[PDB]
Design a protein around this ligand. Structure first.
Ligand SMILES: NC(=O)c1cc2c(-c3ccc(C(=O)NCc4ccnc(Cl)c4)s3)cccc2s1
Length: 331
């Protein structure tokens, strides 16, 4: 209609084969529906209906290009990325046919309880699959730029995960200087300051997600870009002086003496000058309930893995291979 979204009807047949029976969620970047393919023995499929407007039309065609490249590079489907079956058009809207996947990780956490999180064994298996998805993204020279529980889907048995939504995705050479890239809570410090970014932004997002997967709550629930840096510095201390100078938007958060400018509400803004930020955030205490040694040792290994991921400088950040060979996964 006026906004761009398609008015989906239950019982409607798309591309003379896809009989729509139910809705998945429908918010969203591009509305998704559940359908049965009558041309393929009524087998279940997920249809993503891309918005009619030119803003999302270019986004949909870009997503179609990225999904094709990632699927062709992974024929055996071992690098945990969403599989695109085919594409078609319906009433001016681009429609993408995908795997019949159950739900996203944000929906799984809601069913687990308020600040409960998943089991350490599931978090371990999910980590490896998330790192395997990062390996394929790096090989294809693609940045996801939106890794979060909402964009990670699971099968009915919840044993296999698949990374979805390649709408905000981009190529390495096609890098843009923007501090609003990646969903705020999963945004890497290099994006905020305006430093040259690469695959490390996807690694940072996985780290934020893995903490949320076990704790059931957001790691850095920052209201603004400035508050995001403060919460990140509450764990690993003050950002290195060499990193600050390399950033384009350094003046918005730091001064000439390389000191952080913390913005606080009340209602007018109050700037607090900080020469040094002492690490106050206890990542171990936040992770732990206190249960048996078999689980206790695994939680401590996740803490060490998170410390290696949550490094402010992307050059001093853990690699994909090291993350896969880490003690937390190898058990
Ligand atoms: N939003 C997207 O880009 C995509 C979402 C999906 C999905 C789904 C995402 C969310 C789905 C869904 O049904 N969510 C609601 C929900 C909540 C709790 N339990 C169940 Cl069984 C379903 S399906 C499946 C396959 C491909 C794609 S692409």
């Amino acid at each position: 209609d006026a906004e761009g979204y398609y008015r989906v009807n239950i019982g409607e047949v798309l591309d003379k084969r896809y009989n729509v029976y139910g809705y998945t969620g429908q918010g969203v970047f591009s509305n998704v529906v559940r359908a049965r393919d009558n041309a393929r023995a009524n087998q279940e499929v997920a249809v993503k209906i891309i918005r009619n407007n030119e803003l999302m039309q270019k986004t949909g065609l870009k997503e179609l290009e990225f999904l094709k490249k990632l699927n062709d590079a992974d024929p055996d489907d071992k690098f945990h990325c969403l599989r695109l079956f085919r594409h078609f058009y319906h009433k001016q809207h681009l429609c993408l046919v995908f795997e019949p996947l159950s739900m996203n990780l944000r929906e799984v956490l809601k069913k687990y309880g308020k600040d409960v999180g998943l089991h350490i064994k599931a978090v371990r298996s999910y980590s490896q699959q998330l790192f395997l998805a990062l390996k394929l993204l790096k090989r294809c020279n693609i940045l996801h730029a939106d890794i979060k529980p909402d964009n990670i889907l699971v099968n009915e048995s919840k044993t296999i995960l698949k990374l979805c939504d390649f709408g905000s995705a981009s190529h390495v050479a096609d890098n843009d200087i923007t501090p609003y890239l990646v969903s705020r809570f999963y945004r890497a410090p290099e994006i905020i300051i305006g430093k040259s970014y690469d695959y490390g932004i996807d690694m940072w997002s996985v780290g934020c997600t893995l903490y949320e997967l076990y704790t059931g709550k957001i790691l850095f629930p920052g209201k603004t870009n400035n508050h995001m840096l403060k919460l990140a510095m509450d764990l690993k201390g003050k950002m290195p002086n060499k990193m600050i100078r390399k950033g384009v938007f350094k003046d918005q958060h730091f001064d000439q003496n390389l000191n952080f400018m913390y913005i606080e509400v009340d209602e007018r803004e109050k700037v607090t000058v900080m020469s040094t930020i002492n690490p106050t955030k206890d990542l171990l205490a936040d992770l732990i309930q206190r249960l048996p040694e078999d689980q206790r040792k695994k939680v401590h290994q996740l803490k060490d893995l998170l410390d290696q991921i949550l490094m402010l400088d992307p050059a001093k950040r853990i690699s994909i291979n090291q993350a896969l060979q880490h003690a937390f996964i190898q058990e």
